[PDB]
Design a binder for this molecule. Structure first.
Ligand SMILES: *[C@@H]1O[C@H](CO)[C@@H](O[C@@H]2O[C@H](CO)[C@@H](O[C@H]3O[C@H](CO)[C@@H](O)[C@H](O)[C@@H]3O)[C@H](O)[C@H]2NC(C)=O)[C@H](O)[C@H]1NC(C)=O
Ligand SMILES: *[C@@H]1O[C@H](CO)[C@@H](O)[C@H](O)[C@H]1NC(C)=O
Lengths: 48, 48
């Protein structure tokens, strides 16, 4: 809930992070928008 | 002449309450701007 220069696993970007309610399956690391741009991520240190 | 007019305004009201396609002149002008923007967002997925 602040704007940040985030980087997960080398997927660098800029944005405000938030608690999602998407259910990524165990094999999925990233969720994508209609523009092939990442709009959700699972954190690699806590699996939320 | 008043009864025919009042009845014809009644037929307009019921016709507009019944068919969808008559306003297609306006709905198509909304659909074309929406489709043009959906296409412009999709092009952010092209590798070029
Ligand atoms: C010119 O056209 C008029 C129709 O737009 C027409 O009016 C219609 O006249 C008939 C009787 O001749 C009416 O028929 C109904 O009459 C009563 C109910 O009011 C019922 O008992 C009958 O069963 C029947 O349903 C129409 O209601 C009436 N329509 C309107 C809008 O008034 C004129 O008679 C025509 N004039 C001439 C000079 O031909
Ligand atoms: C990462 O660190 C925490 C705190 O030390 C630890 O509890 C957790 O097990 C670690 N994460 C993984 C994926 O093991």
């Amino acid at each position: 809930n602040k704007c940040v220069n985030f980087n997960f696993n080398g997927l660098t970007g800029t944005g405000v992070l938030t608690e999602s309610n998407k259910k990524f399956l165990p094999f999925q690391q990233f969720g994508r928008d209609i523009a092939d741009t990442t709009d959700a991520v699972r954190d690699p240190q806590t699996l939320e | 002449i008043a009864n025919q007019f009042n009845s014809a305004i009644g037929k307009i009201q019921d016709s507009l309450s019944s068919t969808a396609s008559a306003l297609g002149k306006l709905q198509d002008v909304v659909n074309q701007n929406a489709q043009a923007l959906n296409t412009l967002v999709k092009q952010l997925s092209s590798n070029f």
